[PDB]
């Protein structure tokens, strides 16, 4: 739940770093 939100945040983080 808040775990989804934290996982999401990491996925957004790394997505922003992708080639």
């Amino acid at each position, epitope marked *: 739940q808040e775990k989804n939100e934290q996982e999401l*945040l990491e996925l*957004d*983080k*790394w*997505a*922003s*770093l*992708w*080639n």
Partner: antibody
Amino acid sequence: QIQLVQSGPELKKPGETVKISCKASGYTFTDYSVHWVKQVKGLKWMGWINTETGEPTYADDFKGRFAFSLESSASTAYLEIHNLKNEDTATYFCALGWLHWGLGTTLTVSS
Amino acid sequence: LDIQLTQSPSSLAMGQKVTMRCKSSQSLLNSRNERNYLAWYQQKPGQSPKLLVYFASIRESGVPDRFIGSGSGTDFTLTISSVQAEDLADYFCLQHYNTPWTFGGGTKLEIKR
């Protein structure tokens, strides 16, 4: 768990060429862009290299004398500067995007 | 169309609370994921920049919680709740919304007397 190890201090003469390396670990190297930043007294963004295709992208003030390259199998990125100028004197950082900056490589160019 | 960042103040003097600001010439809000593409870094002489806060308001892991980023769109702030001696340093903002990436002019944290 991310580390970016950069090559040591450089002392060069005008006209020469220097090659700076950035060795990455703790992540999939070819998935994320490496950026290069110049710091003299503020910070200047030099451009980025696509770690997937190898394609470099240069900021306006960094077009002709600067080369971004890679050895992907070695998880290493390179900054090569040719025809060195006095004002190339600076600290150069590679960065894993905005997430994590290298320790920096100081370059001094002088006759 | 290079994005401009204006950072203020250029310096402030502290165990009280301090505030520094960054104003963007263009919105840094990504409509798609609703994140703001702005990070805050600390940097001490001879050393490299250290990420404090990313996506405008998310503290990086292990960063002391006395550090607080906030703001959205074109207006952003970094707050240090209670300044410690280890926090004396330069701080700057970075926009990574568009290339070329651009940086604030920095804020230096010194001791008041």
